[PDB]
Design an enzyme around this catalytic site. Structure first.
Site: not given
Ligand code: BEF
Ligand SMILES: [Mg+2]
Ligand code: NA
Length: 219
Positions: A8, A10
């Site tokens: 992920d 963020d």
């Molecule tokens: F969807 Be992740 F938080 F970039």
């Molecule tokens: Mg995230």
């Protein structure tokens, strides 16, 4: 040994939350809705753009047309895109660059498994693109978290099964997505939010190759 890490963006690689908050606050000020402060903004975390806009409209019992609604959401997005223009390598969270280097050194595949439609841009701004073997495109999945789609896509894009992979996430729905993909989740945050059935670290400084190996072997 695991063969890939599915990141992920963020809350793992960097934080964009301040920019989202400031984008919403700017829009609320422009349209004259009071109450979009930092405490209120907690209600917008992990919520879709449209559901977030609705929460803001609801502060003033404001009713709009579908066209008006679409335009307000667009204006917030325009705000956000302007605000992320100065993201830099200094914004990479602690430990993450060394982890990327260590994964690459050890021939472990690296994929972005982010919901962000700005993922490629943000990785360029942070000088991280060269570490990534693939970016799963969140525009090409049928369903968002807690569906597993982006994690399956990311694993496949680097030529592995999710079962050969670790996924890193800061959100409850993201953890569920990883679990359902078949990959091994390691969350960053607290169990109140993420659950108590997965390994969780308090911050990203704990995401080291040695720790990921330890977790994998325990499994
Ligand atoms: F969807 Be992740 F938080 F970039
Ligand atoms: Mg995230
Ligand atoms: Na590449």
């Amino acid at each position: 040994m695991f063969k890939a890490v599915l990141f992920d963006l963020d809350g793992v690689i960097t934080d964009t939350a301040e920019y989202h908050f400031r984008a919403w606050k700017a829009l609320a000020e422009e349209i004259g809705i009071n109450g979009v402060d930092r405490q209120f903004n907690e209600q917008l975390k992990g919520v879709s753009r449209e559901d977030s806009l609705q929460k803001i409209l609801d502060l003033a019992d404001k009713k709009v047309s579908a066209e008006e609604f679409k335009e307000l959401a667009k204006r917030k997005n325009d705000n956000y895109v302007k605000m992320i223009q100065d993201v830099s390598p200094a914004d990479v969270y602690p430990g993450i660059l060394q982890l990327l280097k260590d994964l690459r050194s050890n021939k472990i595949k690296i994929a972005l498994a982010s919901a962000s439609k700005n993922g490629p841009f943000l990785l360029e701004r942070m000088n991280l693109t060269g570490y990534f073997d693939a970016i799963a495109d969140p525009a090409e999945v049928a369903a968002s978290a807690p569906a597993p789609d982006i994690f399956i896509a990311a694993a496949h894009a680097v030529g592995v099964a999710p079962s050969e992979s670790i996924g890193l996430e800061d959100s409850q729905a993201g953890i569920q997505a990883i679990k359902d993909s078949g990959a091994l989740p390691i969350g960053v945050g607290r169990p109140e939010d993420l659950g108590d059935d997965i390994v969780i670290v308090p911050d990203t400084s704990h995401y080291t190759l040695e720790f990921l190996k330890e977790v994998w072997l325990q499994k």
